[PDB]
């Protein structure tokens, strides 16, 4: 599941969850021009130990 969340986020760059399972902290609002800085933020508790901080940061 977490690798399929990664490969849905390399392809289309959009994913759907209602439970915290991935290293992205999504904000549901669509914003106006603030969209870039704030809809996607780095959640660190869902980073695997076979991935590093660089991998999550770059794919985000």
């Amino acid at each position: 599941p977490v690798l399929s969340f990664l490969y849905r986020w390399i392809y289309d760059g959009e994913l759907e969850d209602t439970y915290h399972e991935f290293f992205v902290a999504s904000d549901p609002t669509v914003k106006t021009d603030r969209l870039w800085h704030d809809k996607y933020t780095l959640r660190k508790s869902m980073i695997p130990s076979f991935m590093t901080m660089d991998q999550s940061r770059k794919v985000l």
Partner: protein, 636 residues
Amino acid sequence: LQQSLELKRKMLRDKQNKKNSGQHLPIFPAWVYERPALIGDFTALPIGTLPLASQESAVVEDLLYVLVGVDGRYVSAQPLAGRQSRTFLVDPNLDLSIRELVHRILPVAASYSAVTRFIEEKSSFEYGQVNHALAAAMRTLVKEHLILVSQLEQLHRQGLLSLQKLWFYIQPAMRTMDILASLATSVDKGECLGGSTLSLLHDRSFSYTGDSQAQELCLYLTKAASAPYFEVLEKWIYRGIIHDPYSEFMVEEHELRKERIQEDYNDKYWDQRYTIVQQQIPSFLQKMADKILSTGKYLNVVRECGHDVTCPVAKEIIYTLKERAYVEQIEKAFNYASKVLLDFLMEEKELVAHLRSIKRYFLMDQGDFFVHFMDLAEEELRKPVEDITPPRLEALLELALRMSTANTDPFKDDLKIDLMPHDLITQLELALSGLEAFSFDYIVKWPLSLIINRKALTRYQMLFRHMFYCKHVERQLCSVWISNKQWFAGAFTLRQRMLNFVQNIQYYMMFEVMEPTWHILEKNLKSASNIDDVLGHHTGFLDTCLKDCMLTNPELLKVFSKLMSVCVMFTNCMQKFTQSMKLLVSGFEATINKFDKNFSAHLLDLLARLSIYSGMASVISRLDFNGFYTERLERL
């Protein structure tokens, strides 16, 4: 038994602090100790009062239960529930002839239960890498022991066995259990783990050379145990990244990534960042150890910058008895390492031009550049120290460079004018500079800081500063020559001799030192099979070029400094006396003759102090090529 529980936790702790990406390491659950999940191996009548034809059937059936490590019926397993020791008690009143034979069967039993306990105690999550492989490889022999016990099990089911058959049966198996129990005792006793029980497994295989029943046993467990180790090895070898997410390997990577990044000030790659560790050497890879280290050390600095490198081919290698699959792959791996690094560097981040643009200025290949720059910078240069300002000297450099036809090399703005802060003490005043100093900082680039060192650059500066005295005295002698296009005819001879001397000194450095060993270096850096030869060739070029020239002498030649001092004193005096006569013939000769005497002293001392030394004797032969001032003082 008790000693293991300590080690296991501490081996965990080393790897939580070394990895900053280690996450949620386990605790061993308490129930595995409170309730049995490790060890599973932990009415009674006197046999002597029984009839005979019940005693035989009963003692055979009970001892068969007793062997596994737990109580039978009339033979009991004495409680220890631990270490390599176990004793069994048959009833003392058994008939003497049968009981002495029952006592003889017991050594396979005490060397079975012990053999089981090593597989039960050391199934824990932590211990060394070889011991975890060895548990899974020793259990295979427990299974092959069972297939003989399975035949025995069927036979005992069919209402038949006797003690003489059993005694004849267990004679082959006793030795194999003896070898396994001795191995378990030695591995637990010495507190050896990791790679230090890859030494013990290597030594025990050599030790047996009289039967080779146990030699092959140690060989089988070592060939099984070296199969994960060589895959971790091939991960480190074919690409610089370790694709194993533990560090068990003989190479470890220090984290000096937070000291040197986008600059090198230690040369961390070639010192000890990728180092080897003694207690993870298996003691059959010790012959290959330096090669193994140097291989992947070369791979990192190509796999980092963006060049796709992978395995060209990989093949399995195994520890085999006094024979090597490993050597043939280590050598090919080594040549592949050095070839991809050396090819990638000699095309992108060109070493060729970096060495050429050092030969062009410090060893001096363009003279037009310096005859422009020295002339247009000397009036700032002549002043005492801190009266110079480096923006101005840098700006006039950008002149004399861009006027001169030296515009054909990529690295020419890397030259920045700095000074030696402690000027003559760097060689092996502080109020004068630009009369005894002229130095640059040529900046060295990211992989060219590992092939040209800091020490290399300061030696280049010291050789350039040694040539600065000749560069100074040469052009001062030309400018005093144009004054005479009164005087003294011997003053013209003194002038002629001094300029002849300095011109010969530099020409000898030209066609003797820099150009020939540069011609050797353009062969050596392309005929190397490792980069520890390439470093050696660069260090050897600099070492030769310093040893042949006058930078290394037994006595260091203070007369060289005194000689160039009286050369400067002569040109100052002659310019002053010529302009304050026409613009005598006796006092002029009086000052010029004293400079003649001082110079002849300092020259003859030089020829004698160079003749004791030593090829590089060509310096003495060319100065006395005439047979004038041909060394009239004897020493030695």
